[PDB]
Enzyme design. Sequence first.
Site, mmCIF file in Angstrom:
data_model
loop_
_atom_site.group_PDB
_atom_site.id
_atom_site.type_symbol
_atom_site.label_atom_id
_atom_site.label_comp_id
_atom_site.label_asym_id
_atom_site.label_seq_id
_atom_site.Cartn_x
_atom_site.Cartn_y
_atom_site.Cartn_z
ATOM 1 N N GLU A 137 54.614 -0.747 66.180
ATOM 2 C CA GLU A 137 56.033 -1.257 66.375
ATOM 3 C C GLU A 137 56.420 -1.478 68.042
ATOM 4 O O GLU A 137 56.845 -0.985 68.716
ATOM 5 C CB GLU A 137 56.905 0.325 66.403
ATOM 6 C CG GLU A 137 56.586 1.154 65.173
ATOM 7 C CD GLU A 137 57.303 2.427 65.087
ATOM 8 O OE1 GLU A 137 57.951 3.132 66.120
ATOM 9 O OE2 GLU A 137 57.571 2.815 63.835
ATOM 10 N N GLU B 71 54.147 3.462 57.770
ATOM 11 C CA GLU B 71 54.873 5.031 57.954
ATOM 12 C C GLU B 71 55.794 4.909 57.112
ATOM 13 O O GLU B 71 56.399 3.951 56.890
ATOM 14 C CB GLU B 71 55.200 4.821 59.554
ATOM 15 C CG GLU B 71 53.987 5.175 60.614
ATOM 16 C CD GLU B 71 54.765 5.499 61.945
ATOM 17 O OE1 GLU B 71 55.728 5.597 62.140
ATOM 18 O OE2 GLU B 71 54.045 5.216 62.820
#
Length: 309
Positions: free
Chosen positions: A134, A251
């Site tokens: 991220e 995720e």
Amino acid sequence: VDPFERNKILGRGINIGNALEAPNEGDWGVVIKDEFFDIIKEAGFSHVRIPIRWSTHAYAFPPYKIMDRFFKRVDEVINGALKRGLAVVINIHHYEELMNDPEEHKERFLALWKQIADRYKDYPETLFFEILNEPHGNLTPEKWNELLEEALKVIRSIDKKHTIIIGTAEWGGISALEKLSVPKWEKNSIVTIHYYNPFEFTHQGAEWVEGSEKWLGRKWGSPDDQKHLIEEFNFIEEWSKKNKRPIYIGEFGAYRKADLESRIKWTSFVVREMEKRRWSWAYWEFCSGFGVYDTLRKTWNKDLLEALI
Ligand code: NI
Ligand code: NI
Ligand code: NI
Ligand code: NI
Ligand code: NI
């Protein structure tokens, strides 16, 4: 090597989070027991994703050496999983200074990847290198495009066998996917996206999220719900086809505070739509706040495991 075949090999998985991506293993409630790998393999999962915080286990100044003791711990986690026939995704995760200060920390980050690629270059082809979890903040989409190419060059100078996993900026969701650029010369990479939509649903009551209680009692499963999720996945698929990059939903998950039903509906629906598209995926996460296996009680959440597997 065919990255699409590697993506099939990756298949369905689970994050072992709140472990090695803490400042130190155990600081956030999970320590990775060798036994976990038997448990995860027995449940039907193909792989594990291991969030790893290298930045707190390496020297601050050149040559930025990763500590021996920590490399040995990571070896132990990787080999423990490989031994069960599980594929393994390792990454760099929570490099906090890098996100805020990419200009200074680029050099250190790349030195970390040089060391990691070098240590695992001869490991089985079921080990995947995920560049960075991220990218966000001062590490903008443009700067991420710049950093990831340099990372690719560093890794590829050492290792041309392992498949590399490349995330998106602006926190690794779909917002920055259109901005993502993977160099044409790199031909063994999988693009990763983290999917938590609708965010207000999946994170209702999430303590670490500001004003999240406003969303409590939020439900999912309606049919606009399904139209929208399908639409967002169509976007990802289209991009995937146009750019010819395999997709990994690294995720996804719904917090507990979410009601177990809507939770089930959401989880099983996401799973079925990803598998329609032949996407690899990893549930967030194994045993913590989004956990589906209680490690003290040694029980799986049966409803959720069924939704996943
Ligand atoms: Ni140490
Ligand atoms: Ni520019
Ligand atoms: Ni989140
Ligand atoms: Ni709202
Ligand atoms: Ni039940």
